[PDB]
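Reviewers asked in the last cycle whether our approach scales beyond single polypeptides. To address this, we selected a multi-component target totalling 1844 residues and predicted its structure end to end. The input consisted of the following lines:
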Amino acid sequence: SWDKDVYPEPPRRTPAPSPQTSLPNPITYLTKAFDLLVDRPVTLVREFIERQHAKNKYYYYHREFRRVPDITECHEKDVLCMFEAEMQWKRDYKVDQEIVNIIQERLKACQQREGESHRQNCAKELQQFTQVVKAYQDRYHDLGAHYSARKCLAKQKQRMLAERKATKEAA
Amino acid sequence: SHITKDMLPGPYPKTPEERAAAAKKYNMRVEDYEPYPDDGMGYGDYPKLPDRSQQERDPWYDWDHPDLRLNWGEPMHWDLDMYIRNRVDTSPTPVNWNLMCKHLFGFVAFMLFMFWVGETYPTYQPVGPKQYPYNNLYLERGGDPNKEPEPVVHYEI
Amino acid sequence: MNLFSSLTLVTLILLTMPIAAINFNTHKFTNYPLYVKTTISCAFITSMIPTMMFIHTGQEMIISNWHWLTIQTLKLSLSFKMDFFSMMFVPVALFVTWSIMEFSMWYMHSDPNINQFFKYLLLFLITMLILVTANNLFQLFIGWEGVGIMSFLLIGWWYGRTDANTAALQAILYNRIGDIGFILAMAWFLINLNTWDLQQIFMLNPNDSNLPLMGLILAATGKSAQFGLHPWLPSAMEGPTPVSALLHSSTMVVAGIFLLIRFYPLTENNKFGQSIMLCLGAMTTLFTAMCALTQNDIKKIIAFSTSSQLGLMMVTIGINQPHLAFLHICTHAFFKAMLFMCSGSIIHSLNDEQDIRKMGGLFKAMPFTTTALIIGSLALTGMPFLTGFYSKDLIIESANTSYTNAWALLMTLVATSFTAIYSTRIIFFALLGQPRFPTLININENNPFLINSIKRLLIGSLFAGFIISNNIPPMTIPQMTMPHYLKMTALTVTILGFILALEISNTTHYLKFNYPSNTFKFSNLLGYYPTIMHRLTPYMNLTMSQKSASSLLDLIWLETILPKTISLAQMKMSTTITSQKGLIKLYFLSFLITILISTTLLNFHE
Amino acid sequence: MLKYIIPTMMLMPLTWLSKNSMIWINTTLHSLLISLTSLLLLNQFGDNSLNFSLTFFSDSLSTPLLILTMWLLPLMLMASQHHLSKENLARKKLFISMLILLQLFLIMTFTATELIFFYIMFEATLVPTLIIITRWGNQTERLNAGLYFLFYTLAGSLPLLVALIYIQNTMGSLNFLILQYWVQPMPNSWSNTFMWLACMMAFMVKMPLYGLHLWLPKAHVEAPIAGSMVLAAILLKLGGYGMMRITLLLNPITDFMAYPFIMLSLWGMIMTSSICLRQTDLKSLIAYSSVSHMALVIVAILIQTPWSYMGATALMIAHGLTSSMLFCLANSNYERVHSRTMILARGLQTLLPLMAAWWLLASLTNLALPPSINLIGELFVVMSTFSWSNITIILMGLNMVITALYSLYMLITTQRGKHTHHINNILPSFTRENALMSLHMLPLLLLSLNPKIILGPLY
Amino acid sequence: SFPKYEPSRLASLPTTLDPAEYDISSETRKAQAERLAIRSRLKREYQLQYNDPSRRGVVEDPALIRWTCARSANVYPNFRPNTKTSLLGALFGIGPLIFWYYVFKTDRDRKEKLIQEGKLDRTFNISY
Amino acid sequence: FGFSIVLVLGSTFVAYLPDYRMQEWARREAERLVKYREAHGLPLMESNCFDPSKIQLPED
Amino acid sequence: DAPPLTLEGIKDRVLYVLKLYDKIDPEKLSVNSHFMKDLGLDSLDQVEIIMAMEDEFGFEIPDIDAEKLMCPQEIVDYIADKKDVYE
Amino acid sequence: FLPSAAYLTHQQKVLQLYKRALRHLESRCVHRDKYRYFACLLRARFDEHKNEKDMVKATQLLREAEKEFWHGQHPQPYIFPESPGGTSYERYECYKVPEWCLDDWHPSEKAMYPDYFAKREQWKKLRRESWEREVKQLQEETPVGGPRTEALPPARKQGDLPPLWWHIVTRPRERP
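The resulting structure, written as structure tokens, was:
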């Protein structure tokens, strides 16, 4: 299962076909025969395998880590601060990429479920996608291959100094 | 094994002994042995052949090598890897070569020019644009939920 | 629906047993053709159901699972999508290939290599299915290169025959130019939309799109025998008959225009793009129609005809009408599968001689095949109104009711006239002439598999166009309001083509021994394009391979710059240092001049 | 890691104190046991490398290459009989122990920590290959082959030592983390240009780049099969591994100074794919194919994208397997006829009707058939270089077309159309060569299913 | 009645309209007789060393060996650096290299200056 | 000892093993973090990953 | 596509198409007859006969042979060599 | 380019022209009746000056005939589907296996087909039994120090097989 809060679904909508025919309805006959001749033994086998696995219990824990402080609280060369700082930053980098993956999966689900009216009821999700990708483009993009943490902080300082000069000139 | 003097150093000169040795070596007619000549492009002293030779050699001779027209002892023209049938077929053409290229270039040039004459001059059956119901079908294009209404209407005609 | 996804995935998985079966068997099954035929029939009967469910309600759904290398901000799973094209094309292709399984049971009765043949043909079907279903575009590229290389193997089935593997080399080369176009399209989609997946491409419509559109154009004109890159098509007809039938009936021939159909939201706008579409298609259609006249090999004629119909579909994509082009795919598929199968029936009936000269009169040599070919070749141009009517004539009238390019309309005009005249000429020269074919006749069609296959495809090509064209969801607004002398013009052009080929026939009855007037030669001799390109482009690259590349630049100059300078320098310096004869006065004079030249000239003590 | 080092030592006196018809089972069995032993390695996770000592460690670039080496040894050892089984027993033992010492210095080289140790084990990787190819070079110019070989690799790799000692005594020690965690940018003075030029040019020699690719073809046409597989797969991808490590330093000037090498690599990739379309000596076509793939590798290394490095390491591993396999098939054909030429041995669709299946499978992997790893590598490198420039895709696609054509010409030239019917000595296919093909093309397809292992550090 | 069939480097000249086959001197008869004699002796040697029932190996043609040794190993000897060789070497070896080099300098300077302006479409350009 | 103990055992050993480069750990961690940042109103993926209070721009 | 040929059948078919030819007689039409001595026809119509065999049976014969058939028995022998006529 | 002599002759050159023009007239002309008319017309056109005692005017008319032929040929001359260039060109070469094979089989299948392999073994003993003496003596016996021909004499001496016959007899059957 999953968290439906973080994976939202639109409310379900289903009509009922009303013939207004007299052939009648071969596919209903076929889907009833399909359910009776396919869905029953797989259900019984799944019941069997569920008992055989629920006879004893395992667990896998979600791994959780602490928060070692920052690169900004590390000294000149002094590796024993920088090591914790950069592995903390790199784990934030991987989880941030997977956040972007989750937003894009939401965007694909909104494209498929909303149908051929594209620009209806995806515009808020498109809005938050452009917001988060503006953040990602501004923050992690143009550093290249050998990012460690230091080029990220250099980009940070250079960006906010450029914006400070821009608002100083605009004022 | 293989004789050391069945290799091939140096070009044609001088004419008696070297051409006699190449006639004894490459198994050719004496005054049909042709080096390239020596412009220093490498090439050794290997013969020049009539250079097409493979849509030639009409296939009812019943030689040895059935898909190469070999006869086990021909001096084997330098560019043979470009001349196996399935690579380059130099048939005597049914028309020409110049006539071919001139008519092909003329036809393709004329058709592309008529395409340009089409591109500047469209057809249309005489009909105005469609009467989209809600402001050129607004709110269902790219977005804009409450930014700007774009008022444009249609009148019954 | 669980039924919908379940039946589609088992239509996939039914084409997985026999390959692994005879890879695991080692005991040679006698009933292997029967087995492959009945599993294709079971795939057909499982594929008929969810398409009927699709037209019954809709419920238009994608499947996506088993993600591998979900590396960066993208991901890619094996995923394919049931919308309309990948939804209800698959029964047509399975039906066509099932009839070809019948016809290849019979036609390949006399080879022990039949099992590998059916393995290759079923593998080609699997890859064509994985091509036409996917929305994850990497899987599309998988299906692309797989159907290319299965086309290579099935053209080069008969080893020996240097013309055959020459031809297969041409086919795989134009497949790779399709590959460079497709990977340029994939490059632009990745670097400007963070994925290569159909759904997000449709979600965000970019403004500047000329580079991926040119990539898609290059992919289509490489894949589907279009002008500039067309002449691999008689090349593709070099191979065996059911290979050729499946190769250019539905599978591997529509895959070039299948992509441009699939990207219809991207090719909505960019009128420059649609102009490129329909101008290129008009060029293909006129050139292959003009080349199709004065040809005497049957398979080259049927291949030029299918290139002309594909050019009509390129024009159909040039106008914003993709769904009529898909209608044309289905009708065309039934149509020329039945036509190739009738042709191969005639050819193997008459000792594999295949040429129209030395075939002349074969009407009433049993008229099942003559009836079959006149059904097919009058379904060409659409005798009003049959399955062939709908696609071709609604396409040309909708093109006439469109903001067209004013020259492509005349190209479709002349192309419809040309396809009429070679259709009527091939019927006359094939069937109702005077019988010119060598003696000891061995004509036989009292044959259950052949009458089943030809029966099944005439029953298909008589009804399926109307049945499919009736129950489409209306995906466009039909025009239906034409002026006078613009709806009549279809039947006008086809009737004048019939009359024109009739009068050419009744001049062929005469005796004059006329002369070539070089338009005869331009029509007959492929005009000049395969000869010029296939004799100039191999010679140029291999002239540059021998002189410049191999013998000149790398070997002799790179060996005379990096080794030889060093080796000559070391050799000359050795032979001037250590080549000193053994006297003592030399050594002490060298000592003295060294002491003086170290003390006072280049000083060491100051 | 010493758990892998010391049985590779103890596989050497095994070969000495085994006797006739007794060395073989011992060497092959125990080398396959070491293959399982390093299949146990793959633990590497998340944050960093894994340190197998104060001296050894493994990046995730190094794990698939190390597993590839210990996979490739027993395959190679079975491959190198029937052309020396009739030679002497002591010379055969010397050959096997030479290969074992060779693998030992390869493991030494891949599991390096310090770049000086890496350099010592680099030329210790060099010295057994020399002795193998010169002692069993089997043709009249093995002299010139070994001479060109050793002088190119040393005289290119000679100033690399000087540059690394200079980096050693200007920036502290040379652990890869302390090469990292402390590296500062170095501006565009010309001494920086020569230092970058020295390191990158030594590994350019070892890839090869295009201006120094005639190092290669003599050293493969006049080599035995074991030294050829060693040389091609492990030495060229070892050079790529070395540049992939040492490109961490000197990033602020590689943009300004990397322009000629990219263009040399691109135009030489086109020229090399052109030059292997028309040559005879079928063994050499795989060598120029290797130059083409390594030119694509060098494009991928000098552009510095994580996309580029993932595509680079996938292209490394897939091309290593493809080239080693295809060398083994060319050795099979040379065992059939004593020619080495291309146009002579023809036919063979009739005869040996399943050798052609392996030729087809190798030719389609060299085509980069799309589920395989080679297309994964080439595709991500093309993606990264198109983000590098909007123009270079002409060269990549034209490489793809000419690569398709020469690989297909290799397929349908020697094994399509007509046997020359004056051969009449070729045997039906042994179980041994079929076993070698099966050892090649099971792991390539099994990685084609699940390729998340072989991608690089920037996964 | 016909423009007499101008030849080319691709269109072969067929055996009919040579028109040198119709000026038959005695030298052409002598050359054809000697050429038939050469082909006769070569086919005799080949067929006698081709039909031997004890002959196991291949017939080992010296023609193919001689052509291969002339093609690969007999290039570097012999050579002299001529004006034509040096000219064509520096043209077909250095010309395209320096041309592609300058055009990639131009494209890279365009893209660097344009993204230094910042007005490029890299709103999301992640896969660099 | 080349297929019957190497190939299928290596296939099982590399078909699954723990999370190579922390993949599904990152999946579920991103799930929980985006659920937290939706359930507490603050915008998901805050830009400026280092704290601007703990930064010092050099001056002109 | 394999009808079995036989020696009597190929003899009958070749003699049928020789008898159908105009300027010979059905009386003096022997199996062992010359195209030069007793039938008296010229080389031109002899190669017309060679063309009739090529156009009936479906394969060329080379001009190294068309000099030197000159009798129907060697015609039957030569198509027996091209076809290898036994079951 | 032919095995018998160093040239064809004038006669056979004119003859090959007649065969080619007649074949191209087939490829030009359908319905076979007007074909027969035009073939007799072409026969009369060659009958006009057949009896020239001159030779140089005959070969000049041959060259002008080649000009009017090459101007008037067909784009697809009607090549039969057994000829090279044609539709077949060794069409069933898939099964044209040479017979130096079939002895490299496992003796299980040699037990499957016993009589054929016994008779094949006595064929090979027939081959080796008369290989050295008669064949090599008849090759190094008759001709001049240069052979200067591509024919070869038969074994008319007393007994056994004509020389150099193995790859002539043991060929594929051209429809397997």
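Residues 1-459 of chain D form one domain. We regard this as preliminary and will revisit it once experimental data from Aim 1 are available.
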